[PDB]
Write a protein that binds this ligand. Sequence first.
Ligand SMILES: CCN(CC)C(=O)Oc1ccc(C[C@@H]2CN(Cc3cncn3C)c3ccc(C#N)cc3CN2S(=O)(=O)c2ccc(OC)cc2)cc1
Ligand SMILES: CC(C)=CCC/C(C)=C/CC/C(C)=C/COP(=O)(O)OP(=O)(O)O
Ligand SMILES: [Zn+2]
Lengths: 403, 315
Amino acid sequence: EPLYSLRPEHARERLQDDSVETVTSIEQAKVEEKIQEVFSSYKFNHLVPRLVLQREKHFHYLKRGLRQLTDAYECLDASRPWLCYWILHSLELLDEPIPQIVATDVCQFLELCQSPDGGFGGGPGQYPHLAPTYAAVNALCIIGTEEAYNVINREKLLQYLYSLKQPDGSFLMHVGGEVDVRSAYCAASVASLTNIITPDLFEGTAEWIARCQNWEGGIGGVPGMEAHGGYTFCGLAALVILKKERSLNLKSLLQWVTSRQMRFEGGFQGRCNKLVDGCYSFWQAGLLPLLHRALHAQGDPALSMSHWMFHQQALQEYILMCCQCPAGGLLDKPGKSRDFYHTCYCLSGLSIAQHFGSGAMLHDVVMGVPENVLQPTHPVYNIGPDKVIQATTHFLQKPVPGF
Amino acid sequence: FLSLDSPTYVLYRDRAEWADIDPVPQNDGPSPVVQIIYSEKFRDVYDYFRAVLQRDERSERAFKLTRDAIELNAANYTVWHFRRVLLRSLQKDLQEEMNYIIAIIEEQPKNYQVWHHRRVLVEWLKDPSQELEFIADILNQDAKNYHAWQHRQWVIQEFRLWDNELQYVDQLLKEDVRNNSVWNQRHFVISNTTGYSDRAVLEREVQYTLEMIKLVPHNESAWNYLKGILQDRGLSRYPNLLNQLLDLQPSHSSPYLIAFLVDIYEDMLENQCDNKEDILNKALELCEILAKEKDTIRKEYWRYIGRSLQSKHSR
Ligand SMILES: CCN(CC)C(=O)Oc1ccc(C[C@@H]2CN(Cc3cncn3C)c3ccc(C#N)cc3CN2S(=O)(=O)c2ccc(OC)cc2)cc1
Ligand SMILES: CC(C)=CCC/C(C)=C/CC/C(C)=C/COP(=O)(O)OP(=O)(O)O
Ligand SMILES: [Zn+2]
């Protein structure tokens, strides 16, 4: 009883290296040693385990970062809209309101980032790129006012997306950039939310994405490349937006993700024979809701009506025990430093693991104190489902540009 | 020329060669958000980069400035784009630029911009001759670097350099048989050369994997490879496979072996196999062995597999 990771038999889930040591096994055993110490610390210190999400610490870390960042974030100077999205999403998940004037200041900042030729860049005067375009549009939707919606130039945005579209179905990340399954997701996310999808915008795109699924079951960044959770999320989520989820072998995909949850740590790895992280609480585990909605759309009557097809409890235990910084913020794994990215995706993953939804059926699992329960997140867009519905509704008022 | 970590580095604002140009400070608004408190050095380089960018100054001094800007934030895609404009306008020698990107990737190997720049150089030069060896040096430091594998695949495909790659694979597999990137490269090489729809290759591949599985039974990579190359023909098409796995249980058992058994049974049942309602119970016995005892992190998947099989292969 009652925390899965502290049960005596859990010790049997440690790595079996068959007496054959390689780089891979040495590195996995190091991680498992650190994590076991975390799991054990309660017993060694003779205290009852109590899992608490340090909301107030996280809130103050976020509140501050929304305004000001140390020079440690110099590496993210071409990604400032990412920071707006990470932090705003984290606040939304923690159920912390956004002052009308931080809202207006974010709006103004993102307008400075918008390019006269469409899309958003990483900061004022930077050229546009699909990653900061995605982040900007998501941030604006989280804010959700008429001001925030009005920032986006839908006409230019559509021009920009066409400028990136390739003959084989793919998109460039930016002009003169290269192509990637990330770009298809960024394009489909922004297009669908703002209602600018034309009949030919995504012609070939599902087939290009389907070419990225490999012998493993997952999706690589381009055809031929190793399966990875980041790319598998982008690929599946884009196909859900395009209604082409059917193009994939969903069954090999399901077997692949589920295989990515670590038996000992409880969190997810990004690819096979690599390390648990942190942000894959969202990128890997967020596949399960998408696979549920897909397999259900095909009439799969073996589907649970209460749980996603991963160990929700073990993931919550990983995040809560191993991924919180005491000063606020969340992280990849013990011994790493906090950051706003892991704060975003660790909390997004926590939320997914807490909330099951499937039409009529709703069911929560909240490990630790009941205060730990977060607001839900939409598995396709990773903003609140209310922000999505809301946003999709307001831009349906307008015609797809051209019309 | 003047390195950013030279003891004698001077800010651009104190350089005489730059006096004619007024820096352009970042326009962040009256009340900024996510405002990063840049070091003096970063802010100084970038104020001058904005100036040359806005004037579209296509000069040797601008070219050298992009170097410092890149070093300060190599993720800055706007600087890389301008550097490429400058490489072309100034007619810079691209082999020297190849020397530069080599040094940069070597320092910051997990960055998209850096590998994309290299690829652009190789396509400008139509010259892949340094690539496999350079890539092998990066992989000697991190054998799982995703960009390095992606660039390798690209070079091999584009310039048809397939002939020595399976040998490279073999080397790395011996170094670390758990390296999933190397198992993936194996599949990539074989399926683009001889293919797997061939009996001589399909076999040797299987015998090699079973041989790897035997040496280290809890390496999931070899198991996923094995499954991967047999499964789209259908596992039940190979009837000896069952037996040969149902023979190393007490010797080499794992949740991987047991789960492979379930995949075999699953395909058997999907085709109208012999002893139908019979092989089904074997599978369920295993599923619940997995969901309750042997692989409980997947309890929700294995209970769902128990179900769907029940649902379509029972009564
Ligand atoms: C476009 C979708 N969004 C929403 C804005 C998004 O965040 O997507 C990603 C953008 C970039 C990335 C790649 C990296 C990932 N990392 C490094 C990392 C994460 N987990 C383990 N590691 C080693 C990080 C890490 C920290 C932060 C913060 N804050 C951000 C990233 C985002 N990027 S990164 O290439 O920009 C980067 C940044 C800092 C860094 O030094 C730690 C290493 C990489 C992944 C997802
Ligand atoms: C829309 C968008 C931009 C989505 C992001 C997609 C995403 C998370 C991509 C990851 C790319 C990748 C192979 C990282 C490997 O890093 P690593 O080798 O350090 O880590 P790993 O060992 O966990 O693979
Ligand atoms: Zn991470």
